[PDB]
Design a protein around this ligand. Structure first.
Ligand SMILES: CCCCCCCC/C=C\CCCCCCCC(=O)OC[C@H](O)CO
Ligand SMILES: CCCCCCCC/C=C\CCCCCCCC(=O)OC[C@H](O)CO
Ligand SMILES: CCCCCCCC/C=C\CCCCCCCC(=O)OC[C@H](O)CO
Ligand SMILES: CCCCCCCC/C=C\CCCCCCCC(=O)OC[C@H](O)CO
Ligand SMILES: CCCCCC/C=C\CCCCCCCC(=O)OC[C@@H](O)CO
Ligand SMILES: *C/C=C(C)/C=C/C=C(C)/C=C/C1=C(C)CCCC1(C)C
Ligand SMILES: CCCCCCCCCCCCCCCCCCCC
Ligand SMILES: CCCCCCCCCCCCCCCCCCCC
Ligand SMILES: CCCCCCCCCCCCCCCCCCCC
Ligand SMILES: CCCCCCCCCCCCCCCCCCCC
Ligand SMILES: CCCCCCCCCCCCCCCCCCCC
Ligand SMILES: CCCCCCCCCCCCCCCCCCCC
Ligand code: NA
Length: 224
């Protein structure tokens, strides 16, 4: 119980500071080519609203835990993970497009493919939820959930990446971190929840901080 709470507080600490940083980031002036970074940052903040509601619910609920509450995380994930996949797509498009590109152009062009990515991701989550609530066994959950994780990341890779180390860093870091949520699923209640509390810092807050630093680097001359 104590370590779940402690890791929850660590996660909340990083969430609060990341939210402050992100809000300031929204007001950094941007060159034309960089406008999509602010569109990404807005969406990451929206993800943070959901995440924070979950964490406040969690620390209140852990005072009197009587059931395995791990499944409640899926009510966050089903909202936040599709947004995070979209923002990832936007960032790859930003890195890889020779000319300035915005989210409306991407959405209007690729909505069908983006739906495929989010549908694959939804099946991953649904299988996980069935496993977390013990409606299917753990082995089926891991193999089915991992199948859809792979499919999601494959769809992302083949449409939106380029073959260079910048792309490999962003793609593989993310893929590994998301895979580690499946790794966490295997562990008992306390360890599993500690792992999710800390993985959220990496999958969400570190991404926001990254986008903020990219914004600051691109725009520092407009600031100074
Ligand atoms: C001034 C603003 C500071 C923002 C937060 C950044 C500084 C954070 C303080 C260090 C901290 O939280 O340390 C935890 C503790 O030392 C682990 O045992
Ligand atoms: C702790 C986090 C503070 C980080 C502030 C970064 C840049 C500040 C940008 C402020 C932009 C205001 C509008 C402007 O300068 O134009
Ligand atoms: C609208 C339809 C939504 C169906 C909801 C969940 C899928 C359930 C799939 C079957 C799960 C039962 C347990 C099992 O697979 O055994
Ligand atoms: C089971 C579901 C289907 C899997 C096949 C894999 C689908 C592969 C789709 C590739 C689409 C693609 O290449 O998109 C970028 C152009
Ligand atoms: C235009 C600059 C791009 C430079 C790209 C590579 C350079 C430096 C490393 C940046 C920090 C690591 C990558 C953060 C973005 C990322 O993968 O987050 C995924 C994470 O949340 C977990 O899922
Ligand atoms: C902010 C929260 C995030 C990014 C949550 C991510 C969750 C996953 C990538 C879940 C993965 C799973 C597997 C790969 C296998 C089946 C069980 C899951 C759902 C935990
Ligand atoms: C002992 C049980 C409770 C442990 C609480 C403390 C756990 C802290 C683990 C690290 C937290 C920060 C994670 C940062 C990201 C990991 C590496 C990222 C590389 C880019
Ligand atoms: C807007 C909020 C989105 C969902 C946040 C994550 C879940 C928080 C708790 C919801 C209630 C679940 C109760 C289960 C016993
Ligand atoms: C707007 C700030 C909301 C913060 C809620 C904090 C709830 C603390 C609950 C105390 C026990 C844990
Ligand atoms: C009380 C309100 C809780 C809201 C939780 C999140 C709602 C969306 C859950 C969708 C589940 C099926 C995909
Ligand atoms: C539990 C439900 C999951 C199994 C049945 C659906 C299979 C998924 C097929 C579509 C995946 C997403 C789109 C991929 C192709 C572009
Ligand atoms: C990439 C960051 C993931 C960190 C996982 C931390 C695992 C801690 C497990 C609880 C301690 C027992
Ligand atoms: Na459970």
């Amino acid at each position: 119980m104590d370590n779940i709470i402690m890791t929850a507080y660590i996660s909340i600490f990083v969430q609060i500071i990341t939210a402050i940083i992100s809000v300031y980031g929204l007001f950094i002036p941007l060159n034309f080519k960089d406008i999509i970074l602010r569109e990404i940052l807005i969406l990451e903040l929206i993800v943070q609203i959901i995440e924070f509601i979950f964490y406040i619910w969690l620390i209140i609920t852990l005072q009197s835990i009587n059931e395995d509450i791990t499944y409640v995380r899926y009510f966050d994930w089903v909202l936040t993970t599709p947004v995070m996949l979209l923002t990832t797509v936007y960032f790859f498009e930003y890195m890889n497009s020779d000319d300035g590109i915005r989210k409306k152009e991407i959405n209007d062009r690729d909505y069908v493919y983006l739906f495929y990515i989010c549908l694959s991701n939804f099946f991953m989550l649904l299988i996980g939820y069935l496993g977390e609530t013990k409606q299917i066994n753990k082995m089926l959950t891991l193999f089915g959930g991992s199948f859809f994780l792979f499919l999601t990341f494959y769809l992302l890779y083949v449409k939106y990446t380029k073959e260079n180390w910048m792309n490999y860093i962003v793609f593989y870091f993310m893929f590994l971190v998301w895979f580690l949520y499946g790794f966490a699923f295997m562990f008992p209640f306390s360890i599993k929840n500690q792992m999710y509390n800390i993985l959220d810092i990496v999958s969400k807050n570190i991404y926001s901080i990254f986008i903020f630093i990219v914004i600051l680097n691109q725009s520092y001359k407009l600031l100074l």
